[PDB]
Design a protein around this ligand. Structure first.
Ligand SMILES: CCCCCCCC/C=C/CCCCCCCC(=O)O[C@@H](COC(=O)CCCCCCCCCCCCCCC)COP(=O)([O-])OCC[N+](C)(C)C
Ligand SMILES: CCCCCCCC/C=C\CCCCCCCC(=O)O[C@@H](COC(=O)CCCCCCCCCCCCCCC)COP(=O)([O-])OCC[N+](C)(C)C
Ligand SMILES: O=S1(=O)NCN(C2CC2)c2ccc(F)cc21
Ligand SMILES: O=S1(=O)NCN(C2CC2)c2ccc(F)cc21
Ligand SMILES: C=C(C)[C@H]1CN[C@H](C(=O)O)[C@H]1CC(=O)O
Ligand SMILES: *[C@@H]1O[C@H](CO)[C@@H](O)[C@H](O)[C@H]1NC(C)=O
Lengths: 101, 51, 50, 51
């Protein structure tokens, strides 16, 4: 049931439940994916796709607000604030020795 | 940050729950709930110094 | 509310009670409440720091 | 920052210009116009006197 899962967006979905009351059931997306047009077909994939043909009702997941995702499905107002940024390694410890003089 | 974006409980096109959830996101944001949950999960274990 | 205009293009921050009477677009700028205060002038005593 | 909240073009409750500016604000952002206009006004004499 709903007890296999934990996280931020499971705590969010419980807190949206006590306000509204819509008691939910997690069916995770199978072909695990978010959404993209395949550039030859135009079909969406994953959680953007399963909202188009009304298979599930919500998308409580890191589904970013993209200009091409908004034309197709309806996003709510945000609950976090992203940004694209670079994950690189922290440089070595330079380790000045005891005999550094 | 290169750009700015954000998340969102995505609903189908023309769903009624586009409005009833953003009432309950803006409510949970002024009550501090959306910062207690971010702090409870992104707490990590800490990094020592940036000297 | 009383339809004397069509838009509200202004620094109109999204609040819980404003969303329940009018409907906003999605944010064109991010912020938060923060404290403004005078930058402190002068320096530390420091009669040491030799 | 104490909280986090944002601006927005306000529309009357039921107006269809909500959704047509919703996509339109996203249109200037991925092109980089919302960053370009903010750069033009919030940048000035930088108070560079730190050095
Ligand atoms: C290497 C070449 C010379 C070697 C020569 C001999 C070396 C022998 C040892 C010499 C020094 C003795 C130990 C010093 C410990 C202080 C630690 C410290 O950093 O300050 C701490 C405490 O500092 C104080 O405020 C009070 C410290 C004692 C006051 C008198 C100085 C002793 C000098 C003895 C005269 C010599 C008599 C003996 C010889 C005739 C922190 O406080 P602050 O940082 O000071 O706060 C002000 C700065 N601030 C406001 C910006 C923060
Ligand atoms: C005492 C005579 C004996 C005879 C010898 C004579 C030899 C001649 C020796 C010295 C000749 C010249 C001395 C003058 C130096 C001081 C300069 C001054 O007045 O301005 C400064 C006073 O700050 C001080 O330095 C206080 C000095 C008081 C001396 C007594 C303290 C210790 C006494 C004994 C201790 C216990 C004893 C126990 C022993 C273990 C302040 O400057 P300012 O402009 O206000 O700037 C503020 C900085 N700020 C804004 C960043 C905060
Ligand atoms: O994708 S949005 O709805 N619109 C674009 N923006 C602001 C322009 C930066 C932001 C900024 C923070 C968000 F959480 C969402 C959005
Ligand atoms: O008021 S909102 O529409 N929803 C709440 N949030 C995020 C919880 C910080 C944000 C974050 C950035 C915004 F620009 C707007 C909003
Ligand atoms: C200048 C005023 C009154 C505006 C600025 N934006 C805030 C708002 O969007 O409500 C108001 C208050 C503030 O500066 O805290
Ligand atoms: C130091 O850097 C090298 C490569 O730059 C890396 O292989 C090594 O793991 C680093 N050592 C650390 C981070 O202690």
């Amino acid at each position: 049931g709903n007890d296999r899962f934990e996280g931020y967006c499971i705590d969010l979905l419980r807190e949206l439940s006590t306000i509204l009351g819509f008691t939910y059931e997690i069916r995770l997306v199978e072909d695990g994916k978010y959404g993209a047009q395949d550039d030859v077909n135009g079909q969406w994939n994953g959680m953007v796709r399963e909202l188009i043909d009304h298979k599930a009702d919500l998308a409580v997941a890191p589904l970013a607000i993209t200009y091409v995702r908004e034309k197709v499905i309806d996003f709510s107002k945000p609950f976090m604030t992203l940004g694209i940024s670079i994950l690189y390694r922290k440089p070595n410890g330079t380790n000045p020795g005891v005999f550094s003089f | 940050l290169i750009d700015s974006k954000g998340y969102g409980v995505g609903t189908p096109m023309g769903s009624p729950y586009r409005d009833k959830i953003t009432i309950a996101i803006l409510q949970l944001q002024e009550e501090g709930k959306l910062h207690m949950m971010k702090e409870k999960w992104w707490r990590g274990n800490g990094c020592p110094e940036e000297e």
